[PDB]
């Protein structure tokens, strides 16, 4: 009949929506967050605990996620490429992004500071200065051996 077609279509849509829910919402995938975001590069000295799909934030609030990490063949540092939502586009260039630890034992995201009032961005450009991600080893080395 037509009620059979209506039901089959309704629940075929229900299953596909549940699939898209497991993908977008349960997993936290790209499509919903992808939208229109513009890339930015960043040079760090150590990226020990930042992973793909790791949040990038400013003043605590997320602006996007990091997209990929690279070991440059030239300077032996870490080049992280990260997306940034289009609405947030007033980040200055002299801004200093660093690697912060969520809570105390959470994943290491990247939080950026306020970069004065010079030229804003190209949204596809690179950041200049940073504060690298900390490591326990050098931390306790500088803490115990040298200071105390």
């Amino acid at each position: 009949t037509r009620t059979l077609e209506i039901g089959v279509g309704l629940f075929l849509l229900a299953g596909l929506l549940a699939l898209l829910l497991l993908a977008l919402r349960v997993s936290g995938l790209s499509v919903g967050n992808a939208g229109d975001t513009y890339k930015v590069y960043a040079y760090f000295d150590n990226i020990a605990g930042v992973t793909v799909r790791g949040k990038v934030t400013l003043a605590g609030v997320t602006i996007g996620k990091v997209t990929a990490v690279d070991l440059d063949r030239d300077s032996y540092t870490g080049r992280v490429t990260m997306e940034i939502n289009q609405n947030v586009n007033n980040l200055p260039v002299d801004s200093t992004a660093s690697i912060l630890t969520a809570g105390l034992l959470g994943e290491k995201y990247i939080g950026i500071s306020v970069g004065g009032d010079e030229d804003v961005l190209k949204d596809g450009s690179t950041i200049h200065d940073t504060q690298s991600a900390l490591v326990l080893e050098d931390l306790i080395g500088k803490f115990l051996l040298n200071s105390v």
């Binding site: 059979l4 629940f11 549940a18 829910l21 497991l22 919402r25 349960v26």
Partner: protein, 258 residues
């Protein structure tokens, strides 16, 4: 006599492989044989109703119950270790990456794997199938073909619905009953799912189950003996096999991707 028992056992052993090959030829002639005149998409819709839409209340209620079981249980075991926020991640990971598709294959082998062999084996006992070839419509393409198609494209959808309702029910018992912090459930959940190894993993594991469940459920019926007891033995053989084809194949699919 022992020489009689061993001959009967070897006959059953070779008969099993004969049936395993006849099933493959049957699936071939059903899925890509020809295009008989009586076919269409209306058959596939009618089947998708009886196979998936009718099997919707069973797997939805079961997914809700298994979710509010998984959460109500893991909360109890994880409180001992000290990890509590992550019950939303642990409950979702077990259901989405494994138990979800497995229990959906167990309930879809039971409801739409028995109501499929019984429906297509009664079609054989009452000569409903034989009266099709004599009309001129290949019953493998008019009867078996939509039933196989309904199973392939409904059991993964039912497994996705199962996982969604199970996750949501686990939330509704963790948050509203067990009082774990609301937002942490979905947060801790989505940061550690890794779609390509949990969502797509379980979805491929569910597709693989659907092809092996809706084919041993549509063949068991087509190759039953035409009697009220042959059908009732086939509708049990198709639950046994399609439970062994769910569990075992899930072991072979999870070795491929942990």
């Amino acid at each position: 006599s022992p020489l009689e028992r061993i001959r009967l056992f070897g006959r059953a052993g070779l008969d099993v492989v004969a049936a395993l090959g006849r099933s493959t030829l049957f699936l071939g002639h059903a899925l890509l044989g020809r295009r008989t005149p009586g076919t269409g998409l209306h058959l596939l819709v009618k089947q998708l109703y009886s196979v998936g839409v009718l099997s919707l209340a069973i797997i939805v209620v079961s997914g809700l119950f298994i979710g509010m079981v998984l959460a109500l249980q893991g909360y109890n075991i994880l409180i001992s270790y000290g990890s509590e926020q992550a019950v939303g991640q642990m409950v979702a990971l077990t259901l989405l990456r494994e138990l979800g598709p497995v229990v959906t294959g167990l309930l879809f082998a039971g409801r739409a794997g028995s109501a499929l062999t019984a429906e297509i084996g009664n079609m054989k006992a009452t000569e409903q199938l034989s009266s099709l070839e004599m009309i001129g419509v290949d019953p493998l393409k008019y009867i078996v073909a939509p039933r196989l198609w309904a199973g392939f494209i409904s059991m993964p959808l039912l497994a996705a619905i199962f996982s969604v309702v199970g996750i949501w029910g686990g939330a509704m018992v963790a948050v509203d009953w067990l009082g774990v912090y609301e937002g942490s459930f979905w947060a801790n959940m989505q940061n550690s799912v890794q779609f390509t190894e949990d969502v797509l993993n379980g979805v491929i594991k569910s597709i693989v189950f659907a092809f092996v469940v809706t084919w041993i459920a549509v063949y068991q019926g087509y190759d039953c003996e035409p009697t009220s007891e042959g059908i009732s033995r086939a509708t049990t053989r198709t639950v046994v096999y399609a439970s062994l084809a769910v569990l075992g194949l899930d072991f072979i699919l999870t070795a491929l991707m942990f």
